[PDB]
Symmetry: C3
Subunit: 154 residues, 3 copies
């Protein structure tokens, strides 16, 4: 059972890109923006875009395995003073595209954002074959981010 134990150890070992950008000043505009293209201009405070964020094709990529990928994006920042209705959205291309939206209104005063989801990657499936283009967009006004934490794990 030696080889099968090796395989199980691999199967139960988390693979991850956990990248933190601290003390930055990054504009997330109201026009759609490729998130990998935006981030790769910055120097991480810790972590690396590789292996989950491909800086050649500007996409999230996955391991070709029947193992689900968990994704989280935590953004510290602000919209302009007085911005009432506002949201942050993030779309992932795929066989069916997924659009995350975090909306708020005047009742909420914090502007910090937390988006989380998962992708049920199939071997030789769409994500494994093509990757995913991540398109971020701020709604209501432009957003200025000062800390960004992005995680993809599988």
């Amino acid at each position: 059972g030696s080889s099968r134990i090796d395989a199980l150890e691999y199967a139960t070992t988390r693979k991850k890109s956990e990248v933190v950008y601290s003390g930055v000043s990054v504009t997330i505009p109201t026009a759609p923006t490729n998130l990998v293209s935006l981030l790769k201009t910055l120097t991480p405070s810790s972590g690396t875009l590789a292996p989950f964020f491909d800086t050649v094709n500007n996409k999230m990529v996955v391991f070709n395995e029947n193992k689900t990928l968990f994704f989280k994006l935590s953004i510290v920042g602000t919209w302009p003073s007085g911005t009432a209705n506002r949201s942050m959205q993030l779309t992932f291309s795929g066989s069916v595209p997924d659009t995350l939206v975090s909306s708020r209104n005047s009742a909420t005063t914090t502007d910090n954002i937390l988006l989380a989801t998962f992708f049920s990657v199939d071997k030789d499936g769409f994500l494994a074959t093509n990757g995913s283009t991540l398109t971020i967009q701020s709604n209501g006004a432009s957003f200025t981010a000062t800390t960004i934490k992005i995680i993809a794990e599988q």
Copy 2:
């Protein structure tokens, strides 16, 4: 090795991943049983079984201490001109869970992504009873044109 066989089972994902393409599905402002709604459609890929029970119109789970991950991705629209709007999805359970994706005038897109998990216990409420999923559009009716639903455990 029985223990290695078991570990391979334990670490193998079980899933329903069902896609409905090119449809025009009304999600009304009144509560609607989601499994009942979907089973009137023909998947472009995947199968409702084993996680979506079309006899009792509910989500069902394996009787295992293994968490179920759920995602509903909808490409669709609220009517042109709709400002305040939301999509909600309730799961029955010992304590019912109500997911809400709300938005307002600031957001143009009407596409929806609801993701959550259920910490299934052996012999617990979900394993025993399953969960009725009740979907409802708020602010106006909604029309779904692509639906992707995933339950995995």
Copy 3:
């Protein structure tokens, strides 16, 4: 062969959790920042236990020192006062970078029930493993009165 490695794999694939249900309660979530563990710990659970993931001495969520992700869910049945239009529930987790969850709604939505779910990619010997997380909850728009609460952390 490989007995210890198999033991370790069985441990790695065994979910550890706190799942606490508070049924038939009346809990005010005010408009000011409020420590969530402090708020819950005086309530007698209907089922489950706050320990080990919710530490009632330091009022923090705490984690096992393992390279294993923690999944978190908070399900709340309750209400804002009648007529409350714009409203949200906010939950912040301290961390190297704090995470701020918001569930907002407006006049279009009648239900006041709330579901917040997320995960934390715990690293062995990392920030959460060493410090835990202070969970701070706040109701926006008006005070919220919770009557059923289900809280889960698993790793």
